[PDB]
DNA sequence: CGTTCTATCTGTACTCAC
DNA sequence: GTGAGTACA
DNA sequence: ATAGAACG
């Protein structure tokens, strides 16, 4: 079910201090500092068809622990599809029932997926095809240069799309 | 030779063979 | 266990 | 962003 920008911010706040995941008895608590909004709510449209949150795992270990062990606290959702790096939840938010999609990436990935979540998805096709002529390969993960892992001396998002060559653009203009 | 239109990436989760 | 086909991020 | 194709 489709909703407004204010609604997706209402709901991640609301999610913001409430995630965490089992992980062998013990309850951890997921940082907000590791929350991170995108798809179209980080790109500011003005209706969303869901609402997209990648979370930034500080360990390889974790990965097959925390979203197939997903919690959020006082609120009821299923899960309609899940795994290591993508989970889709149905949830209850004021009587009616919205997507909310999960993402997570490795803090060495974490420039490349916040790209890449953050979309909208003809940009990424173009900037893609682009690299793929100078023979380059960029995805969720890093960019890779004949199946070798570039390092690229980088933190940010905005540092990554810069070395790559292209134009920084906020994400409400990106296409 | 300029204008305008067109096309283009990559990977995850689930299911169902065999 | 592996590969293909679908749906969808 | 880039480059090819149709059109002028
Ligand atoms: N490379 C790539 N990335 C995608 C694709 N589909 C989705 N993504 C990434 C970029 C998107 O902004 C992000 C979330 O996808 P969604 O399908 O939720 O779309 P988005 O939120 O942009 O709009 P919407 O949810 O319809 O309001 O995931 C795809 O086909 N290819
Ligand atoms: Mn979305
Ligand atoms: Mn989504």
């Known amino acids: 079910g489709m909703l407004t920008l204010i609604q997706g911010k209402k709901i991640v706040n609301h999610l913001r201090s409430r995630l965490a995941f089992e992980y062998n008895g013990q309850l951890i608590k997921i940082l907000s500092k590791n929350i991170v909004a995108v798809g179209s709510l980080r790109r500011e449209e003005k209706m969303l068809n869901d609402v997209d949150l990648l979370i930034i795992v500080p360990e390889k270990k974790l990965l097959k622990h925390v979203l197939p062990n997903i919690r959020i606290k006082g ?7 899940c795994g290591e790096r993508k989970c ?3 949830i209850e938010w004021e009587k009616k029932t919205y997507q909310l999609d999960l993402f997570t990436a490795l803090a060495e990935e974490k420039p490349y997926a916040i790209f890449h979540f953050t979309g909208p998805v003809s940009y990424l096709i173009r900037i893609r095809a682009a690299l793929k ?3 380059y390969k960029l ?4 960019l890779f240069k004949n ?5 690229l001396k980088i933190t940010t998002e905005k540092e ?3 070395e790559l060559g292209f134009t920084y653009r906020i994400p409400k203009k990106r296409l």
């Open 139 to 142: 995805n969720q993960y890093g």
């Open 88 to 90: 889709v939840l149905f």
């Open 75 to 81: 609120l009821s959702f299923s899960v309609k599809v």
């Open 160 to 162: 990554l799309i810069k």
């Open 133 to 135: 002529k100078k023979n």
């Open 147 to 151: 199946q070798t892992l570039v390092p």
